[PDB]
């Protein structure tokens, strides 16, 4: 079992940065040694073979070096759309093996989350439930935190909440919160408030409606 | 060169699952085709690899007896049975060729997501998200999508039919208590809804679900 330990784990950069990420083999594996992208969502794909390689495709900004234990990627000047897991691997012998991955991110300037309200559908109303949402749209950085309140009084039960992976374009998160509650229990209240905390503000940015 | 490999598997623990990867623009038999293993949240493992020439395979130490390839050379299509398969075998299996005998993963296939799970498989409902009732003043709106209550994965959404795509967030799955939850956002100007029609579209195969949600104001 050859061991390929690559470095580092993630990390965050600017656009125009140059980006080097590294891969050690723990016995000599000649230049049998690849390189993969793999965006959000999709397989891993081709970058860098034989050590130093450019695939065809594949842009310029990528380059492989190394030989034998000590292997290098460099993305000279990254860009928004980079952003993706990076995965060495050795075929050099059997069984072949893969690094621990790399995990990109693209590090831009600070955006404050725009935030939207959804009161329950009536046709989730009329099967019993009664589920709100509130979307936390195109913000950075990626680490935010939502309040739910219900007249006025904090709740915390029956929320679910789901980050999408970075933009590829504008390189800002998105985020999705759900609070579930019973029909009964929603037509119970009446203002209904999420409240994000975020860098970007000393105060929370909140979204309420009334739904009387 | 495509490997086109089968779709998403739910199978219970204990049980045998057996993906296929067709392959074709090239000579099968030139060519080594091996299996690629990630659960979510993780790196690669490879599983092994099979010469459809010679029959000849090599297996990864972890996934041997778990593993077992095949080829059946008259459709160009490599196999992996899985058995005794466990939650810790949940997991996207991608099939990859081996450039010759360089060592290197040219072509991938799109994965195959592998879930295993005594739950039962259970529709999603999908209820439209209009904005609050009442007069908005922004330039632009923003509309969503839920999709509650269903299992396995995958489900997938657009809106109208893909042609809307700009300004879209869904939001990955979240399993809660054996059912997933997923949302979709779209924001659009607000010259564009509610004058122009804006349609939610969701698909969950494995319940033969498929419902179209217009998004009415409130």
């Known amino acids: 079992n050859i061991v390929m330990t690559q470095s580092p784990k993630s990390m965050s950069m600017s656009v125009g940065e140059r980006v080097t990420l590294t891969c050690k083999a723990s016995?000599?594996?000649?230049?049998?040694v690849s390189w993969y992208q793999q965006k959000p969502e999709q397989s891993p794909k081709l970058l860098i073979y034989?050590?130093?390689n450019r695939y065809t495709g594949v842009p310029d900004r990528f380059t492989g070096s190394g030989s034998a234990t000590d292997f290098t990627l460099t993305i000279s000047s990254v860009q928004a759309e980079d952003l993706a897991d990076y995965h060495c691997g050795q075929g050099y012998s059997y069984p072949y093996t893969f690094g621990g991955g790399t995990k990109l991110e693209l590090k831009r300037a600070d955006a404050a989350p725009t935030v939207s309200i959804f009161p329950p559908s009536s046709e989730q109303l009329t099967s019993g439930g009664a589920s709100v949402v509130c979307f936390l749209n195109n913000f950075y950085p990626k680490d935010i935190n939502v309040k739910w309140k219900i007249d006025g009084s904090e709740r915390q039960n029956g929320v679910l909440n789901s980050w999408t992976d970075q933009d590829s374009k504008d390189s800002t998160y998105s985020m999705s919160s759900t609070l579930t509650l019973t029909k009964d229990e929603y037509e119970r209240h009446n203002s209904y408030t999420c409240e994000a905390t975020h860098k970007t503000s000393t105060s929370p940015i909140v979204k309420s409606f009334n739904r009387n | 060169v495509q490997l086109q490999q089968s779709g998403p598997e739910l199978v219970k623990p204990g049980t045998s699952v057996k993906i296929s990867c067709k392959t074709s623009?090239?000579?099968?038999?030139?060519?080594?085709i091996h299996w690629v293993k990630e659960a979510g949240g993780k790196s690669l493992a490879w599983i092994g690899g099979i010469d459809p020439n010679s029959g000849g395979t090599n297996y990864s130490p972890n996934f041997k007896g778990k593993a077992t390839l095949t080829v059946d050379k008259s459709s160009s299509t490599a196999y992996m049975d899985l058995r005794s398969l466990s939650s810790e075998d949940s997991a996207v299996y991608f099939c990859?060729?081996?450039?010759?005998?360089?060592?290197?993963?040219?072509?991938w296939g799109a994965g195959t997501a592998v879930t295993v799970s005594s739950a039962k498989t259970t529709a999603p409902s999908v209820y439209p998200l209009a904005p609050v009732c009442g007069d908005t003043t922004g330039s632009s709106v923003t509309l969503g999508c839920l999709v509650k209550g269903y299992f396995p994965e995958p489900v997938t959404l657009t809106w109208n039919s893909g042609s809307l795509s700009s300004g879209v967030h869904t939001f990955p799955a979240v399993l809660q208590s054996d059912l997933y939850t997923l949302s979709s956002s779209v924001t659009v100007t607000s010259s564009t809804w509610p004058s122009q029609s804006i349609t939610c579209n969701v698909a969950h195969p494995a319940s033969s679900t498929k419902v179209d949600k217009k998004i009415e104001p409130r």
């Open positions: 016995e000599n594996v000649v230049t049998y």
């Open positions: 990859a060729r081996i450039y010759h005998y360089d060592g290197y993963f040219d072509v």
């Open positions: 034989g050590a130093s």
């Open positions: 623009g090239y000579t099968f038999t030139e060519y080594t």
